[PDB]
Amino acid sequence: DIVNRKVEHVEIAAFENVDGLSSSTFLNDVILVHQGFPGISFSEINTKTKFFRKEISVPVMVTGMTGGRNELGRINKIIAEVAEKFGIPMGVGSQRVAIEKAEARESFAIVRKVAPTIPIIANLGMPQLVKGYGLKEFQDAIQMIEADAIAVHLNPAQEVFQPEGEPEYQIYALEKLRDISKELSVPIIVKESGNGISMETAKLLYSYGIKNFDTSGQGGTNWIAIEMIRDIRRGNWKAESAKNFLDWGVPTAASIMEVRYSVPDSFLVGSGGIRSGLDAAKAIALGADIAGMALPVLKSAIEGKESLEQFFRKIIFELKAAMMLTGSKDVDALKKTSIVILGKLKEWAEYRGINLSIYEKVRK
Amino acid sequence: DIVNRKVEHVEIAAFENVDGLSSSTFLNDVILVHQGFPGISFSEINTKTKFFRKEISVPVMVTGMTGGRNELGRINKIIAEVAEKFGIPMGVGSQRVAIEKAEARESFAIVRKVAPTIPIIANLGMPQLVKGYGLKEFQDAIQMIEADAIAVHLNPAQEVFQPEGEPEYQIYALEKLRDISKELSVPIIVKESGNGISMETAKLLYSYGIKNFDTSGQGGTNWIAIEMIRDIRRGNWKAESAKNFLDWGVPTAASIMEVRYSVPDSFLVGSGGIRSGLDAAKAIALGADIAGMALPVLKSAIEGKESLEQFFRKIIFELKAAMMLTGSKDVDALKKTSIVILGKLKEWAEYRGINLSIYEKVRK
Amino acid sequence: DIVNRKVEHVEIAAFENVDGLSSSTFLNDVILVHQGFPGISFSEINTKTKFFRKEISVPVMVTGMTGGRNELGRINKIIAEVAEKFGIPMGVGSQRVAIEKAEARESFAIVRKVAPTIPIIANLGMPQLVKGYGLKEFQDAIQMIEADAIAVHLNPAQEVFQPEGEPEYQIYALEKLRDISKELSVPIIVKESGNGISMETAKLLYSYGIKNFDTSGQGGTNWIAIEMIRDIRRGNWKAESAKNFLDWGVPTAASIMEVRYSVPDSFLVGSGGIRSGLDAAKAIALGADIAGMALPVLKSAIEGKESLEQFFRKIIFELKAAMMLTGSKDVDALKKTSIVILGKLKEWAEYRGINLSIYEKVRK
Amino acid sequence: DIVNRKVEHVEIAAFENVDGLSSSTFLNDVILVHQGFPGISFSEINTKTKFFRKEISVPVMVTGMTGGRNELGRINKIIAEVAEKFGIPMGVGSQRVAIEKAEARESFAIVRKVAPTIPIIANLGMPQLVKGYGLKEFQDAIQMIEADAIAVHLNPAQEVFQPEGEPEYQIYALEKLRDISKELSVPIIVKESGNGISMETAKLLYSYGIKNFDTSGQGGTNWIAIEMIRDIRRGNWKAESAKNFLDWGVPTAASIMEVRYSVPDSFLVGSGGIRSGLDAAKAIALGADIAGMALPVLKSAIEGKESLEQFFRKIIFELKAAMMLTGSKDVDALKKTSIVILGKLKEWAEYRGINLSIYEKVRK
Numbered sequence A, B, C, D: 001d002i003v004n005r006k007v008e009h010v011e012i013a014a015f016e017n018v019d020g021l022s023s024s025t026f027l028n029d030v031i032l033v034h035q036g037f038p039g040i041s042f043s044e045i046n047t048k049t050k051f052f053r054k055e056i057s058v059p060v061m062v063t064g065m066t067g068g069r070n071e072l073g074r075i076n077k078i079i080a081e082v083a084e085k086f087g088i089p090m091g092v093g094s095q096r097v098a099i100e101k102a103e104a105r106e107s108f109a110i111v112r113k114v115a116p117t118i119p120i121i122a123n124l125g126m127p128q129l130v131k132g133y134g135l136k137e138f139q140d141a142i143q144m145i146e147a148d149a150i151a152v153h154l155n156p157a158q159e160v161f162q163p164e165g166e167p168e169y170q171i172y173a174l175e176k177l178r179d180i181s182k183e184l185s186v187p188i189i190v191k192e193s194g195n196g197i198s199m200e201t202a203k204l205l206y207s208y209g210i211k212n213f214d215t216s217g218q219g220g221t222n223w224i225a226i227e228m229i230r231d232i233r234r235g236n237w238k239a240e241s242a243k244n245f246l247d248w249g250v251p252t253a254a255s256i257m258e259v260r261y262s263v264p265d266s267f268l269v270g271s272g273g274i275r276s277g278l279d280a281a282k283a284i285a286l287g288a289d290i291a292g293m294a295l296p297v298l299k300s301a302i303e304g305k306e307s308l309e310q311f312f313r314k315i316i317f318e319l320k321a322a323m324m325l326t327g328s329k330d331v332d333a334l335k336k337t338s339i340v341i342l343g344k345l346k347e348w349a350e351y352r353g354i355n356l357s358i359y360e361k362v363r364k
């Protein structure tokens, strides 16, 4: 039944109009300054970077999406086996369903079988921490796929408009998280799910010992939109309310600035509407350590293994083109390449007290 | 015959194209900062607030609209009985017509019969104070519905383009108002009617002892548009002039900033184009104490009692969603939640001498 | 054949698409702050103002347009006789044609016959001052209509794209103008013709003793557009060049700011795209002493005497509405009423060194 | 093969939709302030200016485009013979092809035969300097057309998306360039090719002794677009990546500011999307010494000799009109005429540390 929500999610995300629906990443307001004389050759560009204790080929990850049933597991298999081939890390979808029903454990375990070397990242929802999940459930999720880290997702926006949502985010869940990090063998990433991390949220999380964030800003997959659709589907009256919140949240680019600025030493994934290597480059240049993608990976994986390899090839090339044309020989150079910030993103930062000068210093 | 204007008003407002016609609230320029970790549960959100001496369930009021005849009174009945059920305060329409003709007194009295506990707010027009209304007419309007307060409306824009308008706002009417507040048992609210309160007007009113304002800014019901339509209807030449003034006035959001800034200790209703709980939340967060609605309430009440209950349910839910997602446990927290101010609203405030730093201080 | 240009001008201006073609007044960037409590009555609004030695009913003038032939003179008759009735001043079109051919003298003389009391303003082009016009031609034009002042028009943009244009503006023409003002019985106004006065131009003119300006900015009648059309009409290749300059010039609102700021004690007419009393009010509020109109007056006059009276009635009413709603009892109050300056106009002023604070001081 | 790319380039540029495709020059953000009193006559406007050791009639050049085959040479012949007639300098296309195959030497040599007096500018690509071109190849290209200077083009963006591109820009190529300037009889100009020169690139080039730049910014011919088309044409997968980079680069206007600001004493050609004399005037006023055009010259030359003479006539007239209407008697006056900078260009400059005050000083 929760496994039904799992298929509905994938089905709506893949085939319905929810990518950037009434939302914006603000990435249009970010411009990488072209360098007519790059000072490097294309083939000497090096895209390698660290991902905790491992090394990855490209500063891009597939962020968690699905699992919990068979056709969901065979998607996870396609994603993971291609991810392995390209040396890029992969998060799995929420593992709640695999703690609840043991038949679902396979659709997540397949990932480590077929991707033995890349970082794999586990996934559990924050609301579970208030509803009695603790150290052992976390250890289960982790060692079920031999995870290199665990992602705890923030989705209060989604839970609110969900027909069946559990919108409970009592502060005590953070005390519990902080305790679970005491004795977890792997690091915790806190990620949003299409609505973005603000500087108040980041600072709070940091004050409880969280050092790794994933922006998941608005302008990508619109989870409010997805739940609106589920609501329309069962004539649930919340549908119309959801419509009014379609553009709620921190746009991805704003979130990257906000997190980097408020917690300078963070490890930061810039995600939420990354659709090209150009988007990925902007996010990294803007302040992220790596870029994250979900929806476009799903869409390719559904079409098949080679479709997804073609996709990763395209992303990688686009990224390298952006690096080439900014004179960035490696990921570190990209992180400090010249940018222009315009428009609504500029106004956002100004109002939010982000000093553009001290910001430029912090991102390098 | 003035009872004809009363039906025409309702008929045009309800069924013709006048909501936000060529006008804007500037509320698009206000963004509530999403909090991925709210720190509260949805069901522990408390929406209660004070409304003078009484307590109300939700920081929302129905602002005055109509009365003066029978089908107008049965609308007032539907509005008031639903308002009672939800614990939200209700203003009645201008009571001039009930001071003039005694047959109209019923269409206002019904309100207190069917809504014994919520705050009810009386209504008289400012131009009447120049045309010989005084303490007794005020007391009449008040005790005719056992009002908890009286709203005196400013409508010079409307009076100008009205075919039959009385555009007289001599300063002496304020001396009279100030004298009437001497010996009125209830407080006075001064409200606009679709064209907004500026800081010059607020400061003037304050200097005469008025402490409670209702912004009624542009971007909602367009009263200049309504009178243009009445003018077109009787081939009155003023119709075309009215067309040129369709976007005249202070946008709601600007007005809320202006009044809060210029009179910090005011009790402020933020109204004019509030159409969702999101709009209500923005207005409160921006600086209002409560949000006010008229037109969408009318439209639902015309459709029937349950239609209106469905409407209030939707508004309330939307509001609580906004509170949830900003980590606002109660109305006070919402009043000091994080916002972003962009675009034309920002330019408006900057030009008008509204220091954004001292503004942030004042709203908290 | 210069009398042919005269008819072509009127015919194109009246019946072809040239009003605000690709141009803008920037008046949308000027907002008059609505006053919910005006503090005055509509009927006590006084619209009288000085126009040199005379007094006029309304702070509006009809700026010069035509004359030089019979159907042109009967337009001038309609304009002047209605202008007399309303107590508003009128400029005539360029009188070159009446100095050249004596048969054309009637189409200008009719104006003083039918309008004995209002200020009448003569008209000669600046390029004539380089081509041997002097004190006597000026005196001729003046006493031919018993002018209360003479307007000398700047039209280099127009002359450039004119098929037959004389684009000669040698500095020496100013020495000559300065000398002609020595012994002229009436004041000189220098006006543009759809392309606006900059602060460099105003300062220069001032340094030669000119104290009265008429902005005639872009966003109204587009003279480059008119000459483009004349060019298209005789397959003259300049047509396409003219197309590229369609938005050349200082927008009216920018010009008003520029002239007022650079020459604070100037008498300033704000003209170029004034189409409503609202436009007129904005121009005056912005810094003009009076507002000027040409094209919409032509269009009405062509339709007939009563059509034009209806037009002036509409303009006057609109103006008084703007005054009413800003609490402006008279023209002086309007000149210092509260405004907001946004958008492109704001950027224009900032770049041009117009300090917004010292500007606010100067306009009062 | 390489001579095929040469024809394809011309064919796509001339007949396909690639001029300003998804790109912008930002020239809309530059406004020349109109002067109602120019202070000059149109016929006394002098458009002469220096181009290294020679004098040219107009501050405009034809920047390099083509050559390498016969129908390409007869285009070069039309361009050069008209350029001679008008006294405007002409760059040739890349001469790589004429170093490689001797049959191609004629299509470049024709230029000096038919244009004996104007400056002719040679052309070689930067990537050739890493691939073993040196002093002798440069001297070949130079004396093959008796060049007055040599342009070395930067095209890394193009090389990246080219199906057959050589994206190699190792720093060592600059050491080589700097050495080649040791013993070249003529000056070197470094030009981009549709993607613009940034201040980092300019400063770097300057630090290696380069003093002459050609902005070739985005908003004109879109070379990424051209290669996308070549890619689509051979089902090369890069096509879709190129689509994501269609608006990559420094807009022309931004580039002119950037180069002028970062290297004040530079000789600067402002090119990339110059389509009218108005565009040319803006570029010069903005900070360029001369304006450069390519695509519109190609398009006319393809139509024939007289078509191209008509084109240069139109450009020249437009330029003089702009000069007239800003009171610019000569090129120097235009270089210091009054401008307004708005919009996205303003934001670009502000973020990039271009102080608008010190900028105004530098451009005069």
Ligand SMILES: Cc1cc2c(cc1C)N(C[C@H](O)[C@H](O)[C@H](O)COP(=O)(O)O)c1[nH]c(=O)[nH]c(=O)c1N2
Residues within 6 Å of the ligand: A009, A010, A013, A063, A064, A065, A066, A092, A093, A094, A095, A123, A151, A152, A153, A191, A192, A193, A194, A216, A217, A219, A220, A221, A271, A272, A273, A274, A292, A293, A294, A295, A296, A298
């Ligand atoms: C079908 C599907 C299902 C999920 C998601 C995505 C999709 C499309 N995402 C959210 C995802 O990781 C990401 O943060 C956002 O979707 C924004 O990225 P994109 O815009 O999709 O690239 C997600 N996040 C998470 O932490 N737990 C979950 O189980 C899921 N579920």
Ligand SMILES: Cc1cc2c(cc1C)N(C[C@H](O)[C@H](O)[C@H](O)COP(=O)(O)O)c1[nH]c(=O)[nH]c(=O)c1N2
Residues within 6 Å of the ligand: B009, B010, B013, B063, B064, B065, B066, B092, B093, B094, B123, B151, B152, B153, B191, B192, B193, B194, B216, B217, B219, B220, B221, B271, B272, B273, B274, B292, B293, B294, B295, B296, B298
């Ligand atoms: C039919 C109708 C009639 C009235 C009104 C409204 C409507 C729709 N409103 C104005 C109202 O209280 C409010 O200030 C504005 O309409 C802006 O709010 P909305 O945009 O309608 O939510 C109103 N105001 C008032 O003070 N006296 C009046 O009698 C009325 N009349």
Ligand SMILES: Cc1cc2c(cc1C)N(C[C@H](O)[C@H](O)[C@H](O)COP(=O)(O)O)c1[nH]c(=O)[nH]c(=O)c1N2
Residues within 6 Å of the ligand: C009, C010, C013, C063, C064, C065, C066, C092, C093, C094, C123, C151, C152, C153, C191, C192, C193, C194, C216, C217, C219, C220, C221, C271, C272, C273, C274, C292, C293, C294, C295, C296, C298
């Ligand atoms: C038919 C016609 C002919 C003329 C004009 C206008 C029209 C429409 N105007 C220009 C006019 O006075 C004014 O400055 C501009 O037209 C801008 O005002 P409007 O936009 O027309 O209100 C004008 N100006 C002038 O000084 N001498 C002239 O003879 C004329 N000729």
Ligand SMILES: Cc1cc2c(cc1C)N(C[C@H](O)[C@H](O)[C@H](O)COP(=O)(O)O)c1[nH]c(=O)[nH]c(=O)c1N2
Residues within 6 Å of the ligand: D009, D010, D013, D063, D064, D065, D066, D092, D093, D094, D095, D123, D151, D152, D153, D154, D191, D192, D193, D194, D216, D217, D219, D220, D221, D271, D272, D273, D274, D292, D293, D294, D295, D296, D298
């Ligand atoms: C057909 C064709 C071919 C070339 C070019 C252009 C065209 C249209 N241009 C680029 C040109 O000089 C200029 O920098 C850009 O095209 C921008 O100017 P326009 O937007 O074309 O005016 C060019 N540049 C260069 O340095 N070497 C080359 O051989 C060519 N090739």
Ligand code: DMA
Residues within 6 Å of the ligand: A005, A094, A095, A096, A097, A124, A125, A153, A154, A155, A193, A223
């Ligand atoms: C984008 C996202 C976080 C999806 C999972 O949410 P959910 O509440 O359906 O899953 P679970 O309840 O298993 O966390």
Ligand code: DMA
Residues within 6 Å of the ligand: B005, B006, B094, B095, B096, B097, B124, B125, B153, B155, B193, B223
């Ligand atoms: C928005 C508003 C005040 C409507 C009532 O106007 P009116 O002029 O019909 O009211 P009254 O009955 O007080 O004249």
Ligand code: DMA
Residues within 6 Å of the ligand: C005, C006, C009, C094, C095, C096, C097, C124, C125, C153, C154, C155, C193, C223
């Ligand atoms: C707008 C304007 C100034 C029109 C008169 O121009 P013109 O050149 O036709 O008139 P004249 O030849 O009389 O200067």
Ligand code: DMA
Residues within 6 Å of the ligand: D005, D094, D095, D096, D097, D124, D125, D153, D155, D158, D193, D223
């Ligand atoms: C715009 C431009 C530089 C076109 C020539 O590119 P190319 O790579 O064909 O030049 P080359 O012949 O030097 O490789």
Ligand SMILES: [Mg+2]
Residues within 6 Å of the ligand: A125, A126, A127, A155
């Ligand atoms: Mg959950």
Ligand SMILES: [Mg+2]
Residues within 6 Å of the ligand: B125, B127, B159, B166
């Ligand atoms: Mg009334």
Ligand SMILES: [Mg+2]
Residues within 6 Å of the ligand: C125, C127, C155
């Ligand atoms: Mg003339």
Ligand SMILES: [Mg+2]
Residues within 6 Å of the ligand: D125, D127, D159, D166
């Ligand atoms: Mg090459």
